[PDB]
Design an enzyme around this catalytic site. Structure first.
Site, PDB file in Angstrom:
ATOM      1  N   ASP A  71      46.016  38.976  40.205  1.00 20.98           N
ATOM      2  CA  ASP A  71      45.470  37.736  41.147  1.00 20.98           C
ATOM      3  C   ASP A  71      45.449  36.654  40.083  1.00 20.98           C
ATOM      4  OD1 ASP A  71      44.330  40.668  42.510  1.00 20.98           O
ATOM      5  OD2 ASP A  71      44.658  39.055  43.980  1.00 20.98           O
ATOM      6  N   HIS A 103      44.002  47.283  30.637  1.00 21.72           N
ATOM      7  CA  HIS A 103      43.965  45.859  30.861  1.00 21.72           C
ATOM      8  C   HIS A 103      43.211  45.143  30.001  1.00 21.72           C
ATOM      9  CE1 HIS A 103      43.393  42.407  33.116  1.00 21.72           C
ATOM     10  NE2 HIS A 103      44.488  42.557  33.951  1.00 21.72           N
ATOM     11  N   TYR A 152      43.233  33.766  38.205  1.00 22.44           N
ATOM     12  CA  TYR A 152      41.785  33.558  37.756  1.00 22.44           C
ATOM     13  C   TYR A 152      40.999  32.722  38.895  1.00 22.44           C
ATOM     14  CZ  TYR A 152      42.798  33.678  32.994  1.00 22.44           C
ATOM     15  OH  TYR A 152      43.382  34.293  31.592  1.00 22.44           O
ATOM     16  N   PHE A 162      47.645  34.633  33.435  1.00 16.40           N
ATOM     17  CA  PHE A 162      46.635  34.815  32.311  1.00 16.40           C
ATOM     18  C   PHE A 162      46.485  33.327  31.441  1.00 16.40           C
ATOM     19  CE2 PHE A 162      48.144  39.073  32.704  1.00 16.40           C
ATOM     20  CZ  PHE A 162      46.898  39.780  32.941  1.00 16.40           C
TER      21      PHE A 162
HETATM   22  O1  LIG Z   1      46.360  35.338  35.997  1.00 19.11           O
HETATM   23  C1  LIG Z   1      45.571  36.276  35.780  1.00 19.11           C
HETATM   24  C2  LIG Z   1      44.308  36.006  35.001  1.00 19.11           C
HETATM   25  C3  LIG Z   1      43.615  37.160  34.666  1.00 19.11           C
HETATM   26  N1  LIG Z   1      43.807  38.222  35.274  1.00 19.11           N
HETATM   27  C4  LIG Z   1      44.842  38.523  35.625  1.00 19.11           C
HETATM   28  S1  LIG Z   1      45.164  40.340  36.105  1.00 19.11           S
HETATM   29  N2  LIG Z   1      45.967  37.788  36.078  1.00 19.11           N
END
Ligand SMILES: O=c1cc[nH]c(=S)[nH]1
Ligand SMILES: [Cl-]
Length: 232
Positions: A73, A196, A75, A86
């Site tokens: 998902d 993760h 942030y 991320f």
């Molecule tokens: O875009 C993101 C940011 C943090 N963690 C996940 S799983 N996806």
């Protein structure tokens, strides 16, 4: 092009041409997601990332994708999510802890200096697909748009990639990501699996996993160009 266009316009106007074709089977679903977002806003709720960024991963060429890095998902903290899994905008500090952990491993694996900022756009430009399974979230409510229809869109994307004969390395971080392995297997892709990079799990096996160098070794073995992972 934000939610208005997502609800109203053809995929060819929203994403790169190859991606528009690859996503044609979920064209109606993308439009429905635009309507979902318009309903959220009409109800006085926000969503992240910005409308113009929701489909950003699909604005880099489908044909050039050689590595898939999947996230769950976006942030949930306002101002972090930018439509690439991320990644954050260049002036964000401190980096989200997941991204800080990714960068720790980047420097440990590859030996490059810590990145100057958290912007992963160069990876996207170089054939890394930074794809969250769910492409929007309500601020401060992690995973709040799970089950609203994005999973079919992103599954379609990954299936299209996997189905190609072209090499694909999938970096699968955590248990949710490891659910992609049936598509990947049948597509003759290769997966790198680890815990993760979230601080909840990273020190149980993400650190030391060397996914960047391993991905490149796999790519070269498959006759593909490796990724230039270097960030400024
Ligand atoms: O875009 C993101 C940011 C943090 N963690 C996940 S799983 N996806
Ligand atoms: Cl609208």
């Amino acid at each position: 092009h934000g939610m208005a266009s997502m609800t109203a316009r053809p995929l060819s106007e929203l994403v790169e041409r190859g991606w528009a074709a690859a996503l044609e089977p979920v064209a109606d679903q993308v439009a429905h997601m635009g309507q979902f977002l318009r309903a959220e806003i009409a109800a006085g709720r926000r969503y992240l990332p910005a409308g113009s960024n929701v489909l950003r991963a699909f604005t880099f060429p489908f044909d050039n994708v050689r590595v898939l890095i999947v996230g769950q998902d976006p942030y949930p903290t306002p101002g972090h999510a930018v439509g690439l899994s991320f990644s954050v905008a260049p002036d964000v500090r401190p980096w989200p802890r997941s991204l800080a952990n990714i960068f720790d491993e980047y420097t440990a694996d590859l030996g490059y200096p810590l990145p100057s900022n958290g912007d992963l756009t160069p990876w996207a430009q170089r054939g890394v697909l930074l794809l969250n399974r769910v492409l929007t979230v309500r601020p401060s409510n992690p995973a709040s748009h799970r089950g609203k229809g994005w999973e079919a869109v992103t599954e379609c994307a990954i299936r299209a990639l996997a189905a190609r004969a072209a090499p694909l390395v999938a970096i699968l971080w955590g248990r949710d990501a490891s659910t992609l392995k049936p598509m990947l297997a049948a597509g003759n892709c290769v997966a790198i699996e680890s815990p993760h990079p979230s601080p909840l799990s990273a020190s149980r096996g993400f650190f030391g996993s060397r996914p960047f160098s391993r991905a490149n070794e796999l790519l070269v073995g498959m006759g593909a160009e490796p990724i230039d992972w270097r960030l400024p």
